[PDB]
RNA sequence: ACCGCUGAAAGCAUCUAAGCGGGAAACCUUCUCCAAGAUCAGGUUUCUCACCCACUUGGUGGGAUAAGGCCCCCCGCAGA
RNA sequence: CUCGAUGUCGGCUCGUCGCAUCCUGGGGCUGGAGCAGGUCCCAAGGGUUGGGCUGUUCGCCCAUUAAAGCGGCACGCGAGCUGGGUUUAGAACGUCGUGAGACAGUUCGGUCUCUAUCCGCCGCGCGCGUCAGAAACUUGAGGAAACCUGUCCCUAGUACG
């Protein structure tokens, strides 16, 4: 959550996006990346942001 | 595993909030999480991490008068009765810093770190902050996304 | 505002007034042996003055006191006490090393007097608070002078904080209000006050102006 | 319906708007008044003051009309001072004016010397009649309320101030 | 005044109002000045 | 509590929703007392204000000593 | 809940609490002229007595007071007190029963243990700490104790009547 909010995105939307992309990555190693390599974390955020549909409608 | 809880690996910077228009709730919450370090990926509840928070213009905290004249503060002594009942507005006229501080303490966890963190807080009623030798870092509030 | 002076209680006597009435009088020594130190509100925020009175050996007083008195430029005194004046600015009132006697009183003014109380020692509630101790006649086993009960039984399963129990009394800063100044013997520094004064003969008494009157 | 009532400005000496705050001049002294921010205030082509706000909040209407009466109070007050007349219906009383403030005495000791406020005129029309005037209904009426209930006017005989009527009750005998 | 947990009008000359939420009766004649508790 | 000025919503009215004043042994100051172990451990002033060894000079242990204090002695209307 | 124990009435002593207020204070209304006085709302910081009777709460009563408050905490408080009464043994009048014996019917007499471990409380100390070591003098965050009231005279036998 801390890393995501530093990247201007919440946990909810982060995980939803990762699911839509198909990134079957755990939270353990995701957090390790979030610490030892924020850049790759942000890249994953951009992937998730791209993967999100549009809004709160369906 | 974790790499944060390592002695010496804590950055304690000085953030400043010009808490005038801001409401009491949101103010205290932002100070609370920011002070404890929940904005950092290295948050570690076992240790006294986080950055220092400075509250400015505490006298101006946006509290509705409807509560200034109804919300009360209670300080029991230990003696029969001894309930030192006092109006929050009067506390704002005398020592508003105690008002804000109290509000934060009730938002922090009932533990010892409450005290180790509490000692990292500086609240001054006035606008001017004597401690400028360090680096003040003005902090602003927002709703992040969603 | 709160003018005053340090003195020594010299005991009690009595003196007849002009209307042929007895005045019980406490005798206070307050002569030309009182000097000052200024506590400005611009450093401390108090607006007060320390008053010194007495006579000690310069080889008995320790060195730091000789430093403070050196700053004053004044021969040492046994006692030193800070008298709160007024919440205003004051400033133009008392100077460093000013002679203060009992001539500061106008032979009739009411005064507020304060000082340490006399020793009594550890005593029961009969003196500490004044209890109507049970009697000891009609069967009472052994309760003469005992406090008796304290509190309830189950619900308040404790004792309320600050009950009336045995303790030590004496040596307390008692303030007695609105004593009538009978007469100022400026020639000997002997101040004649109607009424009793806290403390034993030889103790330090602080006498200052009354405000209620 | 007061929302349809504009306020002409007979004097307009310095009647203006300084940040939702109206400063008023005229024959008399100066006045000011904070304008409620929710209500939009502007000046008319002929100088008359126009105060407006729609509705859908009730208090918008209350503030609109209230505001109209306040502006009328400022203008009519500065161009025509307001006054209240007091008649005394009692026994053993003389209106005294020692120095520059009123002293009253009717059936009790220690005559009351009303502490006069700043910006007010007192006047005596008779030993049992006097008046008061000023440029604010809140300031003139304040002194008018601090003289009553002190020795409550008994509706049996009468011993005090009436505001030219008030249908004061009378005794029912004994 | 006549304080009670019920309010109505005594006559066809009075007004019912809410001062601070407190319901009250004013017939402008002191025999009741009825108040909602 | 009671009471009131001004004054809308409701062209009026209205102590009230803006806003204001009076308003008591209760409340908080002011009066008396303890009180900075109140761990934000406060404030002002002042004296001493500069010795030597072990180990890894230091970082660390040890010994001495100035200011000042304490223990023993004669005592107190201070006192278990 | 408790029977390998929760010792109950009343009284004495010491304190606390509520307010649905006995008084003192502050208001309205009146079939409130005035003194007095009816009812109702707010207000619980103080005071709220002394005696006769009763084993007694209760209650009655005298003489007073500004008034002589109602209630809660094991119908407060027995590891602090009393033991009259209640709830043991003996005795006894009356009643029930053939009797042993009973009776919320009465009457005579009838022992109250504790060297205080812990919490809590009352007072006083040792050490550490308050980022050099000592000494003097203060503030006062925030708490404590106190907080009652009558009489007479003047204004004035005035206002009212």
TrEMBL record, chain A:
GO terms for biological process: ribosomal large subunit assembly; translation. Binds directly to 23S ribosomal RNA and is necessary for the in vitro assembly process of the 50S ribosomal subunit. It is not involved in the protein synthesizing functions of that subunit. The lineage of its organism: Bacteria, Bacillati, Actinomycetota, Actinomycetes, Mycobacteriales. It comes from the Bacteria. One of its GO terms (molecular function) is structural constituent of ribosome. It comes from Mycobacterium tuberculosis. One of its GO terms (cellular component) is ribonucleoprotein complex. Belongs to the bacterial ribosomal protein bL20 family. The gene is rplT. Keywords: Ribonucleoprotein, Ribosomal protein, RNA-binding, rRNA-binding. This is Large ribosomal subunit protein bL20.
From TrEMBL, chain B:
One of its GO terms (biological process) is translation. GO terms for cellular component: cytosolic large ribosomal subunit. Residues 127-146 are annotated as: Disordered. Keywords: Ribonucleoprotein, Ribosomal protein. GO terms for molecular function: mRNA binding; structural constituent of ribosome. Belongs to the universal ribosomal protein uL13 family. This protein is one of the early assembly proteins of the 50S ribosomal subunit, although it is not seen to bind rRNA by itself. It is important during the early stages of 50S assembly. Part of the 50S ribosomal subunit. This is Large ribosomal subunit protein uL13. It comes from Mycobacterium tuberculosis.
TrEMBL record, chain C:
Belongs to the universal ribosomal protein uL3 family. The keyword Ribosomal protein applies. Transmembrane segments: none annotated. PROSITE patterns: RIBOSOMAL_L3. This is Large ribosomal subunit protein uL3. One of the primary rRNA binding proteins, it binds directly near the 3'-end of the 23S rRNA, where it nucleates assembly of the 50S subunit. SUPFAM superfamilies: Translation proteins. Part of the 50S ribosomal subunit. Forms a cluster with proteins L14 and L19. It comes from Mycobacterium tuberculosis. The keyword Glycosyltransferase does not apply. HAMAP family: Ribosomal_uL3_B. One of its GO terms (molecular function) is rRNA binding. It holds the Pfam family Ribosomal_L3. One of its GO terms (cellular component) is cytosolic large ribosomal subunit. GO terms for biological process: translation. Keywords: Ribonucleoprotein, Ribosomal protein, RNA-binding, rRNA-binding.
Automatic annotation (TrEMBL), chain D:
The keyword Amino-acid biosynthesis does not apply. Keywords: Ribonucleoprotein, Ribosomal protein, RNA-binding, rRNA-binding. GO terms for biological process: cytoplasmic translation. GO terms for cellular component: cytosolic large ribosomal subunit. PROSITE patterns: RIBOSOMAL_L6_1. HAMAP family: Ribosomal_uL6_B. This protein binds to the 23S rRNA, and is important in its secondary structure. It is located near the subunit interface in the base of the L7/L12 stalk, and near the tRNA binding site of the peptidyltransferase center. This is Large ribosomal subunit protein uL6. It comes from Mycobacterium tuberculosis.
């Amino acid at each position: 959550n801390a890393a995501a909010r530093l990247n201007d995105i919440t946990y909810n939307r982060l995980i939803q996006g990762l699911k839509a992309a198909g990134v079957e990555v755990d939270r353990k190693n995701l957090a390790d990346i979030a610490i030892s390599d924020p850049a790759a974390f942000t890249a994953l955020v951009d992937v998730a942001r791209a993967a999100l549909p549009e809004d709160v409608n369906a | 595993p974790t790499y944060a809880p390592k002695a010496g690996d804590t950055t304690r910077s000085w953030y400043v909030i010009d808490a005038t228009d801001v409401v009491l709730g949101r103010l205290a919450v932002a100070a609370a999480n920011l002070l404890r370090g929940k904005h950092k990926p290295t948050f570690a509840p076992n240790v006294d991490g986080g950055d220092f928070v400075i509250v400015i213009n505490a006298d101006k905290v946006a509290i509705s008068g409807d509560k200034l004249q109804h919300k009360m503060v209670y300080r029991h002594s230990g003696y029969p009765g001894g309930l030192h009942k006092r109006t929050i507005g009067e506390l704002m006229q005398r020592h508003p810093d105690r008002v804000v501080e109290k509000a934060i303490l009730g938002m922090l966890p009932k533990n010892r770190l409450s005290r180790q963190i509490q000692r990292k807080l500086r609240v001054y009623a006035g606008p001017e902050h004597p401690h400028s030798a360090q680096q003040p870092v003005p902090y602003e509030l927002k709703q992040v996304a969603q | 505002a709160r003018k005053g002076i340090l003195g020594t209680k010299l005991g009690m006597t009595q003196v007849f007034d002009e209307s042929n009435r007895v005045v019980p009088v406490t005798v206070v020594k307050a002569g030309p042996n009182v000097v000052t130190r200024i506590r400005t509100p611009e450093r401390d925020g108090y607006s007060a003055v320390q008053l010194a009175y007495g006579e000690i050996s310069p080889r008995k007083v320790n060195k730091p006191l000789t430093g403070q008195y050196t700053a004053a430029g004044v021969n040492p005194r046994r006692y030193l006490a800070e008298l709160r004046l007024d919440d205003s600015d004051a400033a133009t009132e008392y100077q460093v090393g000013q002679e203060l006697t009992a001539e500061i009183f106008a032979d009739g003014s009411y005064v507020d007097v304060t000082g340490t109380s006399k020793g009594k020692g550890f005593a029961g509630t009969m003196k500490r608070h004044g209890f109507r101790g049970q009697g000891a006649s009609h069967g009472a086993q052994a309760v003469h002078r005992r406090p008796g009960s304290i509190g309830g039984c189950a619900t308040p399963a404790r004792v309320f904080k600050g009950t009336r129990m045995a303790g030590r009394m004496g040596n307390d800063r008692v303030t007695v209000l609105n004593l009538l100044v009978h007469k100022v013997d400026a020639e000997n520094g002997v101040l004649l006050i109607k009424g009793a004064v806290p403390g034993r003969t030889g103790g330090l008494v602080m006498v200052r102006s009354a405000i209620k009157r | 319906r007061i929302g349809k009532q504009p306020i002409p400005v007979p004097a307009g000496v310095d009647v203006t708007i300084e940040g939702q705050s109206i400063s008023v001049k005229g024959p008399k002294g100066t006045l000011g008044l904070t304008v409620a921010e929710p209500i939009k205030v502007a000046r008319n082509d002929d100088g008359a003051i126009v105060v407006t706000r729609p509705d859908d909040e009730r208090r918008n209407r209350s503030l609109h009309g209230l505001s109209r009466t306040l502006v009328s109070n400022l203008v009519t007050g500065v161009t025509q001072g307001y006054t209240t007349k007091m008649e005394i219906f009692g026994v053993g009383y003389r209106v005294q004016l020692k120095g520059s403030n009123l002293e009253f005495a009717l059936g009790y000791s220690h005559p009351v010397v009303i502490e006069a406020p700043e910006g007010i005129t007192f006047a005596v029309q008779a030993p049992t009649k006097f008046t008061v005037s000023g440029i604010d209904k809140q300031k003139v009426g304040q002194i008018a309320a601090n003289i009553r209930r002190l020795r409550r006017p008994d509706p049996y005989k009468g011993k005090g101030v009436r505001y030219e009527g008030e249908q004061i009750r009378r005794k029912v005998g004994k | 005044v006549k304080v009670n947990p019920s309010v109505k009008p005594i006559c066809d000359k009075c007004r019912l109002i809410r001062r601070h939420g407190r319901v009250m009766v004013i017939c402008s004649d002191p025999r009741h000045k009825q108040r909602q508790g």
